[PDB]
Design a protein around this nucleic acid. Structure first.
Ligand SMILES: Nc1ncnc2c1ncn2[C@@H]1O[C@H](COP(=O)(O)OP(=O)(O)NP(=O)(O)O)[C@@H](O)[C@H]1O
Length: 605
DNA sequence: GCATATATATGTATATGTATGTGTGTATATATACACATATATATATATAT
DNA sequence: ATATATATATATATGTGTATATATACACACATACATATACATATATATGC
């Protein structure tokens, strides 16, 4: 039975038991992130990046609260699983703050050990800093095995040292003359689904310092002792080199191209709100409210707001926001009221609209892609037909009238158009269907399905019958198959084995016994008062000797014959039943194929 | 303040394994686009008319 | 105020000519190349080592 008891925890146990509430994701996961202007797939833990960004945003907010005179250099050094963030701010105060429990705890140690403490619990409408909750650097202290905070206000140095996952904590005061904050912490890896800080975390932190230096050029961010220059122009051309830019006193927006989905990046003050907010929705609404009637008058096309928006990458920057509200601790969605953001943001949407209208490299690709979609929609027009003949029929394909239904209908394969003009009278109208072919027949051994349906004639054979290249022959329009390749040696040794090797792609036609070859004489000789027939030349080469005086006729083809002998060979045929044996595959490989040393040893016998 | 050492990054040069030949004609068939004129035909454009 | 009578230049088409082209199998046993990558040497340099 499920136990039902109530545990009332402290702040520390509620944080450590419910970690995913307070650091975001505590699991290694994949995302698609803009790194250095590139939409690259990353795989990382957002919790440790969030822990770095808490101290980073604390140092930046120390920058804003002194109006960028202090905390104007921020050193974020990440090496050997150790983050050292040092700024030259005025200092976390040494003055006496009081707990509600009655314990008298000094300033930086109450800021850095217990949560729900900080200097952002005052008025919200004048607070322009990215911090609200008062739990952040204490959350950095909680998920770190080692955490030292060295604070100088100019008169004293307060060292707050915590260890064993803040279970050991001690504050100490030295007389000194430094003025700034140094947070040096080594993260805990027992709760996170990682063990070390890899290069993707340092790349995310360096790209964040680059974006913050773009937003705040006065604060000199350094990573591992290397300076970072932030300009909106080079950052905007890192995304797309044709991005239209527009900078304001608080906003800075760049519009580019998104060919493989939708891309975005937005910053409210110093916060990376990667999941959005009301601000990007209001800015795209104000942009599309000018652009959509403009593209309607320009190119007369009905393209929606989302279809315009999804091809754009928008890199917009919001500075000095007031009363910022966020739906989570990680602050990834600005859920301030739309009147507040609409009053604060003074972005000129019509200038961006005319600037992307006058550009031919962003809007005109949306126009040509949309008319490509509409032309592909217009080209797909089909209807029905009254008793379609042999499904996809052919110009030279005569058809049996009971073909396709339940019957024993036979399809005819010849190579001559002269050898079918006699057929339509001498055949049955219901069971006999004739079709010639152009020239000889492709060597089709071991080669791809696409390269065999590139032939008009081979997909045409597939279109007459029920033959599909990748599956079995079950429902066939002509039940039987009767092939008449030409009677000469080129007509039996080049087109006929290539044809039956093509029919070897479905090795059940031979098994059903329906493969019939119709014999055709190549020598017809008048001897006595009668005509003797010879299917092969070697039949005559055996039987030339023991015959009397005669008048020969070599038979070039069935078109060289007359309608009477045509009627004889159709209405009384000779059906060679070609049966596939066991090892047909190696025999076809040694005949129809690239290697011919097999043909070398095979001719030699 | 200076030895130094080795590490890895990029020339580089070769040696792999393929990939495309086309060879060079024989052989098999098929397709193409024009000029020469009357004879229908057809199909749809205009008039009108109440 | 549009239905229809009707007229007229569109579409083969005949045969004669006069000329093009094109997909394939054949096979060596190389020919030229297509990249190509790849492993390894060495340079410098810089940051450690002293
Ligand atoms: N590295 C730092 N630089 C400047 N101020 C800091 C730093 N670390 C802590 N603080 C301050 O110490 C107090 C502790 O609050 P903290 O726990 O960091 O929450 P926060 O800043 O409100 N962030 P959050 O809880 O996520 O909204 C705040 O007044 C911070 O501004």
């Amino acid at each position: 039975m499920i136990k039902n008891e109530i545990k009332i925890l402290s702040d520390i146990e509620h944080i450590k038991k419910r970690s995913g509430m307070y650091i975001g994701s505590s699991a290694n996961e994949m995302h698609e992130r803009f790194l250095f202007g590139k939409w690259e797939s990353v795989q990382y833990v957002p919790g440790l990046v969030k822990l770095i960004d808490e101290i980073i945003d604390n140092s930046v907010d120390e920058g804003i609260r002194t109006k960028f005179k202090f905390a104007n250099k921020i050193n974020v050094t990440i090496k050997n699983n150790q983050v050292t963030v040092e700024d030259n701010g005025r200092g976390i105060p040494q003055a006496m703050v009081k707990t509600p429990t009655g314990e008298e705890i000094p300033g930086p140690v109450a800021a850095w050990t217990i949560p729900k403490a900080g200097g952002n619990f005052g008025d919200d409408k004048e607070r322009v800093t990215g911090g609200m909750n008062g739990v952040g650097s204490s959350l950095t202290n909680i998920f770190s095995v080692m955490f030292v905070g060295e604070t100088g206000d100019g008169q004293n140095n307060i060292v707050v040292r915590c260890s064993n996952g803040m279970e050991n904590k001690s504050w100490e005061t030295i007389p000194g003359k430094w003025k700034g904050t140094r947070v040096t912490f080594i993260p805990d890896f027992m709760s996170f689904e990682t063990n070390e800080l890899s290069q993707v975390y340092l790349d995310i932190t360096l790209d964040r310092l680059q974006t913050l230096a773009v937003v705040y050029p006065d604060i000199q961010f350094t990573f591992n002792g290397k300076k970072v220059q932030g300009n909106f122009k080079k950052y905007a051309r890192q995304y797309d080199e044709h991005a239209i830019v527009q900078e304001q006193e608080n906003c800075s927006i760049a519009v580019g191209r998104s060919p493989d989905g939708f891309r975005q990046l937005t910053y409210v003050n110093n916060i990376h709100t990667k999941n959005g907010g009301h601000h990007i929705d209001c800015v795209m609404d104000d942009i599309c409210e000018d652009l959509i009637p403009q593209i309607k008058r320009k190119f007369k096309i009905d393209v929606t707001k989302a279809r315009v928006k999804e091809c754009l990458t928008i890199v917009m920057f919001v500075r000095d926001m007031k009363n910022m509200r966020f739906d989570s601790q990680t602050k990834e969605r600005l859920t301030s009221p739309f009147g507040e953001i609409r009053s604060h943001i003074q972005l000129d949407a019509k200038k961006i609209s005319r600037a992307i209208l006058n550009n031919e490299a962003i809007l005109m690709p949306i126009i040509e892609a949309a008319l490509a979609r509409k032309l592909a929609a217009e080209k797909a027009a089909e209807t029905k037909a009254a008793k379609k003949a042999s499904k996809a029929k052919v110009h030279k394909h005569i058809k049996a009238n009971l073909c396709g239904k339940d019957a024993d209908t036979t399809l005819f394969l010849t190579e001559g158009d002269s050898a079918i003009g006699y057929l339509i009278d001498v055949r049955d109208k219901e069971l006999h269907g004739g079709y010639p072919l152009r020239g000889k027949v492709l060597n089709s051994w071991g080669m791809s399905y696409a390269d065999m349906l590139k032939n008009k004639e081979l997909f045409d054979i597939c279109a007459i019958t029920g033959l599909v290249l990748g599956e079995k022959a079950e429902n066939l329009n002509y039940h039987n198959i009767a092939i008449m390749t030409d009677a000469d040696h080129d007509g039996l040794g080049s087109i006929y084995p290539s044809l039956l090797g093509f029919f070897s792609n479905w090795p059940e036609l031979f098994e059903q016994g329906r493969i019939r070859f119709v014999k055709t004489p190549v020598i017809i000789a008048h001897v006595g008062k009668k005509q003797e027939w010879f299917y092969t030349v070697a039949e005559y080469e055996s039987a030339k000797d023991a015959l009397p005086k005669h008048s020969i006729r070599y038979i070039k083809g069935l078109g060289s014959l007359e309608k009477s002998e045509y009627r004889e060979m159709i209405q009384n045929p000779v059906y060679d039943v070609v049966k596939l044996p066991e090892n047909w595959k190696e025999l076809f490989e040694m005949l129809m194929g690239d290697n011919a040393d097999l043909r070398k040893e095979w001719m030699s016998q």
